Every structure is written in C-alpha cells, then in structure tokens.
Design a protein around this ligand. Sequence first.
Ligand SMILES: NC(=O)c1ccc[n+]([C@@H]2O[C@H](COP(=O)([O-])OP(=O)(O)OC[C@H]3O[C@@H](n4cnc5c(N)ncnc54)[C@H](O)[C@@H]3O)[C@@H](O)[C@H]2O)c1
Ligand SMILES: [Cl-]
Length: 312
Amino acid sequence: MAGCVVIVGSGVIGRSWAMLFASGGFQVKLYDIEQQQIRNALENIRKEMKLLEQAGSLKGSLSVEEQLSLISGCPNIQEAVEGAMHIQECVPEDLELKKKIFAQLDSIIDDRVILSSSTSCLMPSKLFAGLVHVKQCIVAHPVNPPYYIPLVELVPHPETAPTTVDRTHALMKKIGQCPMRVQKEVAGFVLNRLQYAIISEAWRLVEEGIVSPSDLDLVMSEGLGMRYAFIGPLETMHLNAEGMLSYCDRYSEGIKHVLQTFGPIPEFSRATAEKVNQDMCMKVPDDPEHLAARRQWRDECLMRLAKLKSQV
Ligand SMILES: NC(=O)c1ccc[n+]([C@@H]2O[C@H](COP(=O)([O-])OP(=O)(O)OC[C@H]3O[C@@H](n4cnc5c(N)ncnc54)[C@H](O)[C@@H]3O)[C@@H](O)[C@H]2O)c1
Ligand SMILES: [Cl-]
C-alpha cells in the first residue's frame, strides 16, 4: 500500500538493506548498473536468508518465503523509482559517481520519495549540492554487518526537511535498526570520529612499544570494550562516580593531564603500517582464507551479542 523501497547498487550494503527492509514487510526493488549484480544479489540473499533462519537469526515474524517474495530485481531505474517511498543508494564510495546518480534521480523523481545515501564519509553538502529535491535528501549510514549491528547515522543536508529526518527515523525503527541524529555534518560523522580518536592513540601506543598490538587489543576486548557493548562513554562517566558532575570533579584534572601527553597525529607511514601488520599477522595471517575465517568468527559473535542485547 505504501511505496516500495529501492536499493540503487546491489552490493554488500545493498543486499543487507534489502534483507532489513524485507524483514520489515517492505517491498524491495534491487537495481544495479550491472544486471548480473542484481541476479547475483537475489541468489545470495536467498542463500543467506536460509542460513539466518537456520541460525535463528532471521528478523521479525515473516517466513523466509514471505520475505524473499518481497524482494525483486528491477534493472530499469525509471520503473524502479516509480511510486517508491525510499531510495537507499549503495553505489561505490566516489563523490563524482554519487553526484551523477543523484542528478539522474533528481530529474525523474517525485516530491515524496526520500533519497538516502549509505555513504560512510561524503558530506551531504557535497552529495546533494544543487539538487531540486534537496529537501528529500539524507545520509543514512549503516555499520557493516548491518544485519547484526543496528546503528544508523542520520545526517541531513542543511536544507533537508524535518519531515525527511522524521520519516527516515520511523522507517529505520520499523526495520529494527537504531537511528540516531547527527545535527550538523562534520568530517567522519560521529562513529568514525570516535573510532579514529581510538585508532590514533592505539597506533601511537603500539608504534612506541608501550604495549604490543595484541595486548592493546586485549585491553579493549577484555576491558573497555566489554563496557562499551552496553553503555556509551558519557554514561560510563555518569555511573563510575556519583553522577557526571562527581566524575568530572574527581577525574577531569587527570583527563587533561593525560591528554596533554598525547603525541602528534600519526603519519600512518608505510613503514609503520608494515610493522603493525607484521604483528597482526602473528594472530591473523593476511591471506584471504585466514582473514575470512576470522571475519566469520567476528560476525557470529556480533550476531550472538545482538541477540543478548535484545533480551536485556
Ligand atoms: N562496510 C561496507 O562495505 C560499508 C559500510 C557502511 C557504508 N558503506 C557505504 O555503502 C556504499 C556502498 O558500499 P558497498 O560496500 O556495498 O559497495 P559494493 O562495491 O559492494 O557495491 C556497489 C554496487 O554499486 C553498483 N554500481 C556501480 N555503479 C553504479 C551505478 N552507476 N548505478 C547503480 N549501481 C552502480 C556496483 O555494480 C555494485 O554492485 C558506499 O558509499 C560505502 O561507503 C559501506
Ligand atoms: Cl609512507
């Protein structure tokens, strides 16, 4: 009864979105510039949904067969977007390519559909520059693997209509994800700014030999990361003293003292990358089979954690 959802780009992220939207009861049309990618996407989604069902990880109440019947290939973009209510773009991370596609869509779409990019790093102000339908534009950035990790960052353009944000929020909630709002665009949005703050100090600590990369990673996974699975950094402050003000009173002099001892932004030189890599390879060799085995274990853990979080 409501429009379908269109996925523009049936790759890694496109396929995950398709599964998310199908589980919410939405009709999904998969478009790609390569028709073979639509065919492969439909085959891989069929195979993955069977795997999820067997793991007990398939979302919502609809059967495998119900959800799969919601997803079809649609190689014609005009037909795909006709009557759509949401278009999620999932083409490669390339500003000129995204702007081209958006300019094509701009000339054919109606005033109700929402146009949403999956981009992890491009600014809405550049993506949607000069578009007639700029009010309908938004970034909805997911976290890979989005079927297990629910966070979606919603990042508007300055001229994005509030209704676009609210509609997109409600849509993300219906499919089971966890939308949040980035009020004004900034480099890295929110998630990558925190991630890169951590990477930057970790890199310096290991380059300096304060700890090995493997021990630094245990400091996170047997320590700080266990807390962060459930509570964010600001709530941690709140709970680790008698409230946030108490925590600042106790610890803020120290936080400043520690931060004032930070080294400069790394170069991330090839020489240092190679030394870090040599260390990483002791635990996880950088050939395809070893990397894929470790990612499969990672994803199983993510899936089990998602299930735990849903119960508490
Ligand atoms: N971990 C991730 O992979 C990840 C996580 C979050 C966000 N993102 C973002 O999602 C977007 C897509 O990433 P991906 O990893 O799924 O890319 P991908 O390379 O897996 O898939 C891209 C798809 O776009 C298709 N394509 C290329 N040009 C096209 C065009 N003109 N029109 C239609 N389709 C076209 C390709 O054929 C391909 O199937 C990127 O902006 C990326 O930054 C990726
Ligand atoms: Cl270099």
